[PDB]
Structure 1
Amino acid sequence: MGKEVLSAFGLMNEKLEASNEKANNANINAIQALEQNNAENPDQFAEAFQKSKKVKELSDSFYNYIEGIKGEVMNQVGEDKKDYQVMDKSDYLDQKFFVGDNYKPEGEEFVRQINDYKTQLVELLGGKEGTYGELVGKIDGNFNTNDVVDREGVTRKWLNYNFEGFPYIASVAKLSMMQSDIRATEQEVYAEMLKGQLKSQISMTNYTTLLEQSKGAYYQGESFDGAIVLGRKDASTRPNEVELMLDGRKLSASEFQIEDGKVKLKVGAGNAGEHKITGNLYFDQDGKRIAVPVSQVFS
């Protein structure tokens, strides 16, 4: 029997497990970033956060199921782990998965778990349609349980073809790449969700033109000077904190006169004559507080 055979499978599995650990770290980082984004402006990142969380928990449940099968077969072979020429039995799995030419309930459970993952994921995204459906194609191609036809014409059963008669390390590698598929689908899904949100924020559908002339007191026919600037209108924007100093008095009576109902910062403050308004709008973006200065005047 080929000594180098099933050693190749071991190298597959080692590379795949290392990559999967790195991918899980990156995915957890991305989820933490999303939760931080939901912390400030929850309105913008809400749906993104919940759908990403659902993907996270589905992916984790499914990954843990696969990993349980992997640990099962690891116990099956024995304590020798980095030795691979030993995982050659092709016995425990089939008798753990099928009855003669029929599925065992747990094998049925395994396949229906796969199908459940796919269908809930795609229905979360909006199946085969809507925004980013090519991702649905990717997931379908990755987890597809449709019975395949062999080159010899037999429509072999999906689990039977995928798993029967194979060395324990072989199905171990199969499951490792299934896990890698789950991690890749995660990484991609968080990518699309956050990207779609960002594009929903950058869209100049969110803006509105304004006039920012130095002074409105334009005398008799003198040459004009002014500008057009894209004032923000998207109500989803919300200054996380506001400090709004008046003419050196009554720093921002809290929502007594300021109202961020719309992104129009309606200030219903009082007055006595000439006035200036100063302060800072604190936006907690991506884990950093940024102060946007305010220095304006009013009669």
Structure 2
Amino acid sequence: SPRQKMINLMYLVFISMLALNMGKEVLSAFGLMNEKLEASNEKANNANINAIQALEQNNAENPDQFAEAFQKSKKVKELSDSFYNYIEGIKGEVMNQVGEDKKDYQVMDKSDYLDQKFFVGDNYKPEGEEFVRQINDYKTQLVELLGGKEGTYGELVGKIDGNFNTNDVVDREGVTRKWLNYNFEGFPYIASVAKLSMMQSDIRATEQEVYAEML
């Protein structure tokens, strides 16, 4: 039986290939990316605070050309902090159910908690509606402060709208899927946390770009 000998030998070989497949720390790339996002986020937050302080002294000495610019800077800083802290709270509520070790990225692959709070059945739960509303209101109020795709920050506003979208997106096959269902449904916890921390890095980048065009 040249076939049974093969099976009796090679089922162990295929179990070994599967064990090597499972032993790849592919999902730890999300965790390493998240660590880098956090670090770059404190770095960019410190840069933003330094720019805010700089503008503070600039209009304290010269409240003639850009005092209202500093007022707008404070308002965007507060709105950005509110959105950042909302995302931070969502990130904490999902980082509290991975285990005692917050650096064991290989087990943060369940996705069950986050899709049980953002949406029930086929539509949004009224706290997952809150996430989408927060994204949309951040985008809208920021665009109002800067000016929508015209006047000033016109290119930046267009960059902002491409970041914090909520428009329904069509997948490869062609069905039209809602934004929050596309972006966070079925994603492992560490992938969702990495995406949220990236969404915070866009908040920091957006505000540092805003203060960049204020000197």
Q: Quick check: TM above 0.5?
A: yes
Deviation per residue, 1:77-102 (Å, 9 max, x gap): 12211110011111001111111111
| Structure 1 residue runs of 4 or more that deviate by more than 3 Å after TM superposition | none
Deviation, structure 1 residue 53: 0.7
Q: Say which SS state the counterpart of residue 129 (structure 1) adopts.
A: coil
Q: Say which SS state the counterpart of residue 128 (structure 1) adopts.
A: coil
Q: Match of 2:16?
A: none
1-structure distance, mates of 2:37, 2:156: 22
Deviation per residue, 1:121-164 (Å, 9 max, x gap): 01111101112201011101110110100111010111001000
Of all paired residues, the percent bearing the same amino acid is 99
2-structure distance, mates of 1:2, 1:167: 17
Partner of residue 12 from structure 1, selected from 30, 33, 38: 33
Deviation, structure 1 residue 45: 2.2
TM-score normalized by structure 2? 0.87
Partner of residue 141 from structure 1, selected from 162, 168, 175: 162
Moved more, 155-164 or 2-11: 2-11
2-structure distance, mates of 1:88, 1:132: 40
Q: Match of 1:81?
A: 102
Would you say the 8 A contact 1:66–1:179 is kept in 2?
A: yes
Would you say the 8 A contact 1:3–1:85 is kept in 2?
A: no
2-structure distance, mates of 1:132, 1:185: 11
Deviation, structure 1 residue 184: 0.2
CA root-mean-square deviation: 4.3
- Does residue 45 in structure 1 map to residue 66 in structure 2? yes
Deviation, structure 1 residue 40: 1.4
Deviation, structure 1 residue 15: 1.0
Would you say the 8 A contact 1:16–1:176 is kept in 2?
A: yes
Deviation per residue, 1:14-61 (Å, 9 max, x gap): 111111110000000000111111211222221110111111001000
2-structure distance, mates of 1:2, 1:37: 55
2-structure distance, mates of 1:102, 1:185: 30
1-structure distance, mates of 2:94, 2:171: 27
Deviation, structure 1 residue 115: 0.3
Gaps of 5+ in 2: 1-21
Structure scoring higher RCO (CA < 8 A, sep ≥ 6) equals 2
Partner of residue 132 from structure 2, selected from 99, 111, 125: 111
Q: Match of 2:8?
A: none
Deviation per residue, 1:217-253 (Å, 9 max, x gap): xxxxxxxxxxxxxxxxxxxxxxxxxxxxxxxxxxxxx
Q: Say which SS state the counterpart of residue 23 (structure 2) adopts.
A: coil
Would you say the 8 A contact 1:128–1:136 is kept in 2?
A: yes
Would you say the 8 A contact 1:7–1:85 is kept in 2?
A: yes
2-structure distance, mates of 1:55, 1:89: 36
Q: Return the structure number with greater helix share.
A: 2
| Paired residues for 1:142-291 under 5 Å | 142-191=163-212
CA 1:104–1:2 in structure 2 vs 1: closer, same or farther (change >3 Å)?
farther
Deviation per residue, 1:152-183 (Å, 9 max, x gap): 10101110010000100010000000000000
2-structure distance, mates of 1:142, 1:79: 33
Deviation, structure 1 residue 5: 1.7
Count the aligned residue pairs. Answer: 193
2-structure distance, mates of 1:53, 1:79: 38
Deviation, structure 1 residue 2: 5.8
TM-score normalized by structure 1? 0.63
CA 1:43–1:97 in structure 2 vs 1: closer, same or farther (change >3 Å)?
same
Q: Match of 2:151?
A: 130
Deviation per residue, 1:275-299 (Å, 9 max, x gap): xxxxxxxxxxxxxxxxxxxxxxx99
